[PDB]
Amino acid sequence: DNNFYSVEIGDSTFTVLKRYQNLKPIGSGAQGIVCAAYDAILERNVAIKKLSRPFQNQTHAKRAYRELVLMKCVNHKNIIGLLNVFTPQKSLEEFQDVYIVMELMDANLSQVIQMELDHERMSYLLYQMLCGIKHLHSAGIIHRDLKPSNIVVKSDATLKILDFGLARTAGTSTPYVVTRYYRAPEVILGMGYKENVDIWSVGCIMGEMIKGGVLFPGTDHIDQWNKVIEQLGTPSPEFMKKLQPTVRTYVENRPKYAGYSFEKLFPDVLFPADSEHNKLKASQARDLLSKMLVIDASKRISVDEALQHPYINVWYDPSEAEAPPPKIPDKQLDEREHTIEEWKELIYKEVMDLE
């Protein structure tokens, strides 16, 4: 009879529009579990993220809201497409679960890291990552959790970014929610952050692509810092000074390191043959790596500069790189506390609006 229907995927219940068929488990976001599904109406694959009673909690609801809002107003060939949203429940009283339907790409960057890209591929993917991010930043939003498994690709070589649960405007204001290996120093050492925090992640991702493996492995949150300084060498005192005093002592106590040069961090053996024409050169790649992977945020290149960098700008196209920002309904400000119930209503209105 009715509009929705239910499938058990292992221990989890997906109740969804009958259009959505053949769910298969595929993943998780910061919040949420995700299935792939056939949309019998549009006749294509999709991805359905279930968020379970997101209002359960300050955290869960904050993130859920953001992700709802951002998924809506964002508009770029390099961000993942919204397709649908719903809830099977029929009233604010009933209300408990949310579902978000998205384009399904083919794979995440996992996946690419082990294969051997030519420069044109490597550079092109980065170029796309950056356009994506310049889109978000252009409206003042920071992804915060860029990382291979949040970047997806398709076999025609296109690429999009994913998961906005952690996305928000500039920092200060909890630590351990960004994935360990991609934590910028500002994030590791608790100093709060600006948009180029995302740049650090891009650098790690790029490094991983070339390296074949995680750039700064890091066996726990504190060891993370060792891996960074072991490779890049010890930050300057100018930098130390910005640390809070408790963290400053630990840091200044670390064994000093010269660090390797990018030439030694990333030697030619690692790269493919250099390009037919000019700028797609290992050394140019090194040069970009060296302006992204920089401990001191205030000395770190921005996306705009990264788009202008010779290794990247060979694809530069203003209609991709300089598109209008997403418009965020100025209500949503990614910070304010609310209540058990205030949230419950916010999300619901928000799903309602969006249904």
Partner: peptide, 10 residues
């Protein structure tokens, strides 16, 4: 310099 239009994900 042409954009690639393929990516081998097999």
């Amino acid at each position: 310099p042409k954009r690639p239009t393929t990516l081998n994900l097999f």
